[PDB]
Amino acid sequence: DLLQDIVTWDDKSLFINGERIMLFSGEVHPFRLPVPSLWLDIFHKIRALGFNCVSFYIDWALLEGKPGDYRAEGIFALEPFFDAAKEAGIYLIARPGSYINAEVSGGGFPGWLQRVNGTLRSSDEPFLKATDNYIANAAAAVAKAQITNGGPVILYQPENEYSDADYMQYVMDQARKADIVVPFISNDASPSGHNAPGSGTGAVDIYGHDSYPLGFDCANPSVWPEGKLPDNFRTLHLEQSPSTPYSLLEFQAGAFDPWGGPGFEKCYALVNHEFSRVFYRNDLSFGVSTFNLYMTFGGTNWGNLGHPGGYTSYDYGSPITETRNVTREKYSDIKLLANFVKASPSYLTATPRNLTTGVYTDTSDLAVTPLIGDSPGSFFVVRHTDYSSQESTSYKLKLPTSAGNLTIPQLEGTLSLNGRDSKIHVVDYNVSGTNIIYSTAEVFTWKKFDGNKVLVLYGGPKEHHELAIASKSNVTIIEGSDSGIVSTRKGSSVIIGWDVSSTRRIVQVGDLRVFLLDRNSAYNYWVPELPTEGTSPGFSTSKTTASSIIVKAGYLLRGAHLDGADLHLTADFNATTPIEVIGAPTGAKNLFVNGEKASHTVDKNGIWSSEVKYAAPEIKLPGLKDLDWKYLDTLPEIKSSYDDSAWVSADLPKTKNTHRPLDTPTSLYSSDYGFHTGYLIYRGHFVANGKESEFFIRTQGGSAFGSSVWLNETYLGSWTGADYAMDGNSTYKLSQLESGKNYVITVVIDNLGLDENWTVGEETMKNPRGILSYKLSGQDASAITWKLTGNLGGEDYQDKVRGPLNEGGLYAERQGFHQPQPPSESWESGSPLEGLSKPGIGFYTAQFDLDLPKGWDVPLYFNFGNNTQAARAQLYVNGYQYGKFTGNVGPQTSFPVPEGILNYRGTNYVALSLWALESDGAKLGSFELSYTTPVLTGYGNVESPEQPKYEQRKGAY
Ligand SMILES: *[C@@H]1O[C@H](CO)[C@@H](O[C@@H]2O[C@H](CO)[C@@H](O[C@@H]3O[C@H](CO[C@H]4O[C@H](CO[C@H]5O[C@H](CO)[C@@H](O)[C@H](O)[C@@H]5O)[C@@H](O)[C@H](O[C@H]5O[C@H](CO)[C@@H](O)[C@H](O)[C@@H]5O)[C@@H]4O)[C@@H](O)[C@H](O[C@H]4O[C@H](CO[C@H]5O[C@H](CO)[C@@H](O)[C@H](O)[C@@H]5O)[C@@H](O)[C@H](O)[C@@H]4O[C@H]4O[C@H](CO)[C@@H](O)[C@H](O)[C@@H]4O[C@H]4O[C@H](CO)[C@@H](O)[C@H](O)[C@@H]4O)[C@@H]3O)[C@H](O)[C@H]2NC(C)=O)[C@H](O)[C@H]1NC(C)=O
Ligand SMILES: CC(=O)N[C@H]1[C@H](O[C@H]2[C@H](O)[C@H](O)[C@H](O[C@H]3[C@H](O)[C@@H](CO)O[C@@H](O[C@H]4[C@H](O)[C@H](O)[C@H](O[C@H]5[C@H](O)[C@@H](CO)O[C@@H](O[C@H]6[C@H](O)[C@H](O)[C@H](O[C@H]7[C@H](O)[C@@H](CO)O[C@@H](O[C@H]8[C@H](O)[C@H](O)[C@H](O[C@H]9[C@H](O)[C@H](O)[C@H](O)O[C@@H]9CO)O[C@@H]8CO)[C@@H]7NC(C)=O)O[C@@H]6CO)[C@@H]5NC(C)=O)O[C@@H]4COP(=O)(O)O)[C@@H]3NC(C)=O)O[C@@H]2CO)O[C@H](CO)[C@@H](O)[C@@H]1O
Ligand SMILES: *[C@@H]1O[C@H](CO)[C@@H](O[C@@H]2O[C@H](CO)[C@@H](O[C@@H]3O[C@H](CO[C@H]4O[C@H](CO)[C@@H](O)[C@H](O[C@H]5O[C@H](CO)[C@@H](O)[C@H](O)[C@@H]5O)[C@@H]4O)[C@@H](O)[C@H](O[C@H]4O[C@H](CO)[C@@H](O)[C@H](O)[C@@H]4O[C@H]4O[C@H](CO)[C@@H](O)[C@H](O)[C@@H]4O)[C@@H]3O)[C@H](O)[C@H]2NC(C)=O)[C@H](O)[C@H]1NC(C)=O
Ligand SMILES: *[C@@H]1O[C@H](CO)[C@@H](O[C@@H]2O[C@H](CO)[C@@H](O[C@@H]3O[C@H](CO)[C@@H](O)[C@H](O[C@H]4O[C@H](CO)[C@@H](O)[C@H](O)[C@@H]4O[C@H]4O[C@H](CO)[C@@H](O)[C@H](O)[C@@H]4O)[C@@H]3O)[C@H](O)[C@H]2NC(C)=O)[C@H](O)[C@H]1NC(C)=O
Ligand SMILES: *[C@@H]1O[C@H](CO)[C@@H](O[C@@H]2O[C@H](CO)[C@@H](O)[C@H](O)[C@H]2NC(C)=O)[C@H](O)[C@H]1NC(C)=O
Ligand SMILES: *[C@@H]1O[C@H](CO)[C@@H](O[C@@H]2O[C@H](CO)[C@@H](O)[C@H](O)[C@H]2NC(C)=O)[C@H](O)[C@H]1NC(C)=O
Ligand SMILES: *[C@@H]1O[C@H](CO)[C@@H](O)[C@H](O)[C@H]1NC(C)=O
Ligand SMILES: OC[C@H]1O[C@@H](O)[C@H](O)[C@@H](O)[C@H]1O
Structure with a gap:
């Protein structure tokens, strides 16, 4: 195949x-x-x-x-x-x-x-x-x-x-x-x-x-x-x-x-x-x-x-x-x-062996898995035998190497595995033709810089380590103090012991330089490939790996390229950052950072040295409470003036769902009528007979859903929602109805998405959304005839730009009012911070400018206070729904929205639906826009995708 x-x-x-x-x-x-x-x-x-x-x-x-x-x-x-x-x-x-x-x-x-x-x-x-x-x-x-x-x-x-x-x-x-x-x-x-x-x-x-x-x-x-x-x-x-x-x-x-x-x-x-x-x-x-x-x-x-x-x-x-x-x-x-x-x-040719305890160390508290193949070059992975251990463990190694079974450290000291850590010790590791007999500290990288080889090693804090090099040469310390470092020769090998320290040491052995770092300083190193034509590194290849350089920076290094005699770094910074370039090519004479010539210095060891200063710019964000908010009632269905004659009729006698047969005279499954996403609204029309006392209804919106019901303009109650409940059983009492008059039952249902289908044969994705069953006391179920809506057009979805899932069945969404430039000047003033005084659903709208500085990556968040009310909110940013907040379920209160969706040097339109599922109404405790560390970025311009504005829709209701 x-x-x-x-x-x-x-x-x-x-x-x-x-x-x-x-x-x-x-x-x-x-x-x-x-x-x-x-x-x-x-x-x-x-x-x-x-x-x-x-x-x-x-x-x-x-x-x-x-x-x-x-x-x-x-x-x-x-x-x-x-x-x-x-x-x-x-x-x-x-x-x-x-x-x-x-x-x-x-x-x-x-x-x-x-x-x-x-x-x-x-x-x-x-x-x-x-x-x-x-x-x-x-x-x-x-x-x-x-x-x-x-x-x-x-x-x-x-x-x-x-x-x-x-x-x-x-x-x-x-x-x-x-x-x-x-x-x-x-x-x-x-x-x-x-x-x-x-x-x-x-x-x-x-x-x-x-x-x-x-x-x-x-x-x-x-x-x-x-x-x-x-x-x-x-x-x-x-x-x-x-x-x-x-x-x-x-x-x-x-x-x-x-x-x-x-x-x-x-x-x-x-x-x-x-x-x-x-x-x-x-x-x-x-x-x-x-x-x-x-x-x-x-x-x-x-x-x-x-x-x-x-x-x-x-x-x-x-x-x-x-x-x-x-x-x-x-x-x-x-x-x-x-x-x-x-x-x-x-590593790929070093064939894995069974794990061991008490074979390569004295203790059985450590496990060692050796990787050993047909040729020299092996690896020993060490961890606590009980992987959850927080214990700090001291140990010595007995490793089989090309120079015989060695007991390590051979010179002074002891190795440490401190808590939840693990090491890969290397044996007969080939650094471009120089054999590292073993090294207990882990390898970060090595390069051949044409003449001189560099190996970078690191260990965690308070650890001692040792390595051995097959080499005739002497050992010199070309940076840092010899404090803590010991060396000796043993035949044709050179042994070196060292203590991890927060200050780097570099040790030279012939044409080989070994960098000795602590883990937290190694965190700041990078190994970018160095393309000589263009700025793309190309796919990963041994030839491209071989011509990479070693760079110490800070927050991020995106890449590096060599443009004649100019060495270019592309980087992001979140603090004042010392930069070091190790292994600069011989032709290179100048340093550029993010397209700007930067001053640099060369030390006795040929390492380049520069610095980039960071100064946080002033970030001006509008206070959301101060905005000119417009309010619109987005549940006009619960007023007796609403005409639902354009709605689809839920009048299918048989469902097409093979997984849950009906309990109702007609299908009230939303997907039978092409509504799969967002809030759903059902309307049941009936003539009273004066014998009604209770209305029972089982709704289903997926786990953590809520639903609310009105009889004409009278609120009956809500299924408030919880994390475990994909469905809800509700019984509401009814004071007597006027026999012979029309009544309409309006049910609003949060749909939180369709199920996955993890188990083959179980068909859980076919779990319907909508009304599962109902009983109107003293009346026959077929006496109620239902209309429903989800997103306008159903599968004939209106917003091709934002996809078939973005907008739901609310009136404001059906009209497209969540989009940029809503027709809102005629709307009432009202903030979501003031909210609703009774059950129902409001729609809130406002615009604001942003003027964030070019060259900076700045995370922005919408933050919602949590007053614990049974309230549901949908956030929209320039038409894109970027948040569902539900106050009695949680846990999300901070909602990030990326640049592109937000316009950083332009106008933004925020929209917010607020649904109150409690009889006292509901409000937002607070609503702030915040930010976290501005990052000086070498990335280019971030382009916004399409943000189609509001326009009157053919056939909206
Ligand atoms: C703003 O602040 C407010 C206030 O701070 C925040 O509101 C609070 O939010 C939390 C989180 O949503 C709410 O707590 C949850 O409430 C759930 C519902 O409670 C009710 O329902 C069940 C009924 O089910 C039983 O009975 C029926 C029939 O009646 C059966 O059909 C059914 O099958 C069951 O048998 C009742 O159990 C519960 O009864 C209590 O209350 C009544 C009356 O007080 C008593 O009479 C009862 O005896 C009992 O005391 C009640 O009726 C509840 O399901 C849910 O429980 C889960 O989590 C519990 C522990 O949660 C704490 O710790 C978590 C970390 O573990 C935190 O994340 C969490 O926030 C909280 O601190 C467990 O004890 C429980 O076993 C459940 O565990 C499951 O979920 C955990 C969290 O994910 C997991 O760690 C577990 O492993 C487990 O997960 C498994 O199941 C879940 C589904 O449940 C799967 O999702 C999961 O993948 C896995 O399979 C929890 O207690 C709280 O009610 C609410 N408070 C208020 C005042 O409203 C609000 O969130 C915040 N808003 C914002 C925006 O931030
Ligand atoms: C040299 C140098 O300076 N080097 C320095 C270096 O710089 C870097 C740098 O970092 C860069 O990042 C750079 O990376 C480059 C890279 O080099 C190049 C590789 O060559 O690639 C780069 O990015 C490119 C992208 O990959 C793309 O290729 C992109 O192409 C886009 C075009 O640019 C764009 C132009 O406009 O067009 C896009 O396509 C869109 C169209 O424009 C179109 O209008 C579409 O609109 C659609 C709409 O989407 C849909 C929504 O669904 O609706 C459609 O209409 C619907 C409608 O809804 C109707 O209802 C209808 O329905 C009908 C139905 O049809 C049917 O008939 C039925 O009967 O009735 C129905 C009714 O319901 O349906 C219709 C269907 O049409 C709309 N259509 C219409 C007609 O209205 O949307 C299209 C989107 O798909 C192009 N995209 C695509 C996918 O095609 O170009 C990018 C390049 O941009 P740039 O030049 O500006 O940069 C890449 N750049 C990036 C950002 O990665 O690398 C350089 C290296 O040089 O930096 C170094 C390091 O610092 C430095 O050192 C160095 O010096
Ligand atoms: C600019 O960008 C840079 C990145 O380029 C950002 O730098 C990063 O910032 C994060 C914090 O946002 C750092 O992570 C945190 O560091 C805390 C520990 O310090 C570490 O360094 C010290 C030396 O300064 C070491 O001594 C520590 O090592 C020891 O401790 C760790 C952890 O215990 C052990 O595993 C080691 O073996 C060492 O013994 C650290 O390396 C650290 O406390 C914090 O981790 C806690 O919180 C996380 C979850 O948030 C938990 O997973 C973790 O377990 C820790 O929780 C401990 O304490 C809590 C109490 O809160 C207890 O409840 C727990 O039981 C547990 O004991 C976290 O890891 C990151 O190191 C740093 N990176 C670099 C490269 O600098 C800058 O933030 C950014 N600047 C700005 C302005 O944005
Ligand atoms: C990298 O990315 C990660 C993940 O994206 C980022 O982590 C998220 O960061 C956000 C923002 O910091 C964080 O949300 C905050 O969590 C805090 C702790 O739970 C909250 O204290 C805080 O809410 C309060 O502060 C806001 C302003 O900072 C207020 O607007 C808000 O109303 C809250 O009000 C506080 O203060 C008032 C009065 O002062 C008081 O009444 C309140 O009770 C409260 O004390 C934010 O919610 C998320 O938790 C993180 N999300 C995740 C998934 O991690 C991270 O920030 C990024 N790192 C960088 C450097 O950018
Ligand atoms: C309950 O609400 C409905 C509207 O949803 C009211 O229906 C109106 O009733 C009158 C009299 O039968 C009709 O002529 C109108 O056409 C109806 N309006 C619509 C849009 O159908 C009904 O009257 C209300 N019932 C009560 C008792 O108040
Ligand atoms: C709503 O009520 C129905 C019962 O009418 C509950 O569904 C039953 O759950 C039990 C045990 O979980 C099953 O063994 C039965 O087969 C179910 N009955 C039917 C007819 O479906 C359902 O759990 C209730 N929902 C909530 C959230 O409590
Ligand atoms: C081989 O590995 C298993 C775990 O897969 C371990 O439990 C067992 O003790 C090992 N056998 C040896 C060689 O000790
Ligand atoms: O985040 C959990 C993940 O679990 C995986 O097993 C599954 O393959 C992924 O699709 C995702 O569901």
Whole structure:
């Protein structure tokens, strides 16, 4: 099943053009950042981690909202994404579904799948047909960008965590029919060998699996439960698919968070820099060669794209935050590790062995997994045997090296593993022809700078280390004091011992310079490739790795290029930053930073030295309470003057849903009528008979939904909402009705997205939204005839620019008043801070200017006070819905919105719906716009995507 000659493989790793590669990869979802001109930003930050690969989903639900009309342009265009990857020199793994899970509405499935007469994710002909147009279009786009045409796409994942075997095979043939030629890779939810090579029909080319050892309950970030760290993955691999290279297609890099959850902060505090350093070195101990972190950039579930088991934010506690910042320590810690892999090709050939206790150390409190292959060059991964230990452990190593079984340290001192940490010790490590016999401190990187070799080593604080070099030369200390450093010669080797310190030492041994850093100073180093024509580094290759330089900076280094005699750095800064360039080429004479000539200095050792001053600019943000807010009633349906005669009639005698038969005379399932997204409104018309006393109603909006009911203009009550309840049972009492008169029951229902469909055969995505059942006491159910609406036009959705999910069924949304320049001068003055005095729903509108300085990346947030009322709000920024706030469920109160969506030197239109589900009415406790550290950026101009303004819609009601 090999079908091209560019990407091949053996049992050890992939090859790209006959050369081994370790794919260190990050998950990014373009649809979760609707600003195409910011995608390159994400790639820069991932390449700067030392990654060479990105993994991404395509969301069917946003691309074919209307059946038969595939649409992937503007903010949903796939091409600028592929271009950005190419520009940053990042390979892509494409995971198009058609089912993607991803914590998005429907797990990727459009709402109209609720009308399809076949089992989802099965070889049922109607379901296969339903996916045909989507895959023929999406996979075609992926095909043009394959590496066989010089694009970045090197692999393709069919489906997602699957389990007929027939179904899998079909999805593969379906992609092959669209010219996908690259190898197929799988993502088994657990390591069970599902669909591995040899499993019959549906077998992929390369077996891959997932793992999230700590799960997703972020409630107790400091606690790592016993026995959760996997230790058998390399054994399982050899049993399940030894012919293909070991592959982790999703490994934990954060966690998702449900409505009513602890928040992504605690999620980060659980999956922090200790998690990464311990767990990721653990994955290297299995000899993983394709290794993707889910998520490495989370983004935002803007425009209702998310599923009910999650809220607006998808920060995920990821290495790169929702606001795209790289402050988290996990980021800097991942960078140390990825740079070691990038610099260490012998890692791929160093065959993994069973883990050991008490063999390579005296203690059994440590576990050691050796990586030893057919040729010299080995690695020993060390961690506490109980991975959760906070203990600080002292130990000595007995390692087998080319100079014999050595006991280390050979000179003074002891090694330390302090708490939740892990080390990769190297033996017979080749630095360009110089053999490092061993080194206990970890490798960051090494380069040959044509004549002189540089090796960068680091350890954590208060640690002692040693290394040995096969060398005849003497040992000189060319920077720092010899305080704490001892050396001696033993035959044809040179042994060096040292204490970790916050001040760098550099030691020279012949033509080899060894940098000795502490972990926290190594955090500030970068290893960018140095292209000599153009500013793009190109894809990752051993030749491009070989001609990289070492740079000490601060917040971020995007890249570097050599323009004749000018050395260019492209960087971001969040503080005054000392810069150092190590390994500048001999022709280089001048330093440029972000296109500006910068003064520099050369020391006795030929290291370049410069500085960039940081001075926070003044940031003027309007106070939101001071704005000229306009109020509009966006539930005019609960006034007796409203005419619903244009509404669709809910009069289907049979549902097309195969998963939940009706309990009502007609279908009140919203997807039967093409409404899948946003708030839903139902209207039940009946003639009274004077015998009515109670009205019972079961509503369903997905977990954490609310609903409110009126009889004519009289409020009956609300299902207030909770995190566990996907549905709600409500009984309301009725004082006597006027026999013979018309009455209308109005029901408003929050829809928080459609379910995923994780278990094949269970059909949970077909869980309907709307009214499940009802009983009007003293009346026959068929006496009530219903109208309903969701978003105007249903599947004939109005906003092509913002996609089929962005706007819901509120009156203001049906008219398009959430868009720029609403017709609001005629509206009443009213702030959401004053709010409503009775149940109902208000719509609030205002505009403000921003005038933020060019050259600065500044995260902006909408902040909501929490007064704990049962109130629901939707935020819109220039037409884009960027927040669902619910005061009695939580936890989100701060809502970031990216530049592009916000206009930083122009006008912005904010809109806000406020729904009161309590009889006293409701208000916002506070509503402030805030910011966090302004970053001096070397990124270019951020272009806004289309922000279509308000315009009168044909047939709005
Ligand atoms: C502004 O501030 C205000 C005030 O501070 C904030 O409001 C508060 O928000 C929180 C969070 O939303 C609210 O707490 C939640 O309330 C839920 C609902 O409570 C009611 O419903 C259930 C009924 O279900 C049972 O019974 C029915 C029939 O009656 C059955 O059909 C059903 O199946 C069940 O058997 C009742 O259990 C509950 O009863 C209590 O109250 C009554 C009356 O007081 C008593 O008589 C009862 O005896 C009992 O005391 C009540 O009727 C509730 O479901 C939910 O519970 C979950 O979380 C609890 C602990 O949460 C704390 O710690 C969390 C971290 O763990 C924090 O995130 C959280 O904020 C809080 O501090 C657990 O005890 C409970 O077992 C549930 O755990 C699940 O969720 C946790 C959090 O995600 C997870 O850690 C757990 O692992 C677990 O997760 C699993 O299940 C969930 C679904 O539940 C899945 O999502 C998940 O993936 C996984 O499968 C919680 O208690 C609180 O009510 C509210 N306070 C007020 C005053 O309104 C507001 O949020 C804030 N706003 C903003 C914008 O920030
Ligand atoms: C040399 C130097 O200086 N070096 C220095 C260096 O600089 C760097 C720097 O950092 C840069 O980042 C740079 O990176 C570059 C990179 O080099 C290049 C690689 O070549 O790529 C760069 O970015 C490019 C992007 O990749 C794209 O290619 C982009 O292309 C876009 C074009 O630019 C743009 C021009 O306008 O057009 C876009 O396409 C849009 C169209 O414009 C169009 O109008 C579309 O509008 C649509 C609308 O989207 C949809 C919404 O769905 O609706 C459509 O109409 C609908 C409508 O809704 C109807 O209802 C209808 O419905 C009908 C239906 O049709 C049917 O008939 C039925 O019967 O009835 C229905 C009724 O319901 O449907 C219609 C359907 O049409 C609209 N259509 C219409 C007609 O109205 O939207 C399109 C969006 O898709 C292009 N995009 C695409 C995808 O095509 O160009 C980018 C380049 O921009 P730039 O030149 O300005 O920069 C990349 N740049 C970036 C930002 O990454 O690298 C350089 C290296 O030089 O920096 C160094 C380091 O510091 C420094 O040192 C160095 O010196
Ligand atoms: C400009 O950008 C730069 C990045 O380029 C930003 O710099 C980063 O800023 C973040 C904070 O936003 C730093 O992360 C934090 O650092 C705290 C610890 O200090 C670290 O450095 C000191 C030396 O100065 C070391 O001694 C520490 O190492 C030791 O401790 C750690 C953690 O305990 C151990 O794992 C090590 O083994 C060492 O023993 C650190 O390296 C740190 O406290 C903080 O971490 C806490 O909070 C996170 C979650 O928020 C938890 O995951 C973690 O467990 C910590 O929580 C501890 O304390 C809490 C109380 O809150 C307890 O409840 C817990 O049990 C636990 O004990 C966090 O990691 C980051 O290092 C830094 N990066 C760099 C490269 O400088 C700037 O912020 C930015 N500037 C501006 C203006 O924006
Ligand atoms: C990198 O990205 C991450 C993730 O995107 C960023 O982390 C988020 O940062 C935001 C903003 O700081 C943060 O939201 C705040 O959390 C604080 C702690 O819980 C809150 O104190 C704070 O709310 C108060 O302050 C706001 C102004 O700062 C007010 O507008 C708001 O009303 C709140 O009011 C406070 O003060 C008043 C009176 O003073 C009082 O009445 C209140 O009770 C309260 O004391 C914000 O909500 C998020 O928690 C973070 N989100 C996540 C997922 O992490 C990070 O900032 C970025 N780093 C950089 C450097 O940019
Ligand atoms: C309850 O509300 C409805 C409107 O939703 C009222 O319906 C009106 O009733 C009169 C008399 O039958 C009709 O001529 C109007 O055409 C109706 N309006 C609409 C838009 O249908 C009804 O009267 C209200 N009932 C009570 C008892 O107040
Ligand atoms: C609303 O009421 C229905 C029952 O009318 C509840 O659904 C039942 O739940 C039990 C146990 O969870 C199941 O075994 C039954 O099969 C269900 N009955 C039916 C007819 O669906 C539902 O849990 C209630 N909703 C809430 C939020 O309490
Ligand atoms: C081999 O590794 C397993 C975990 O996979 C471990 O429990 C066992 O003790 C190891 N065997 C040896 C060589 O000690
Ligand atoms: O964030 C949790 C993740 O779980 C994975 O197993 C799944 O493959 C992803 O689609 C996502 O749901």
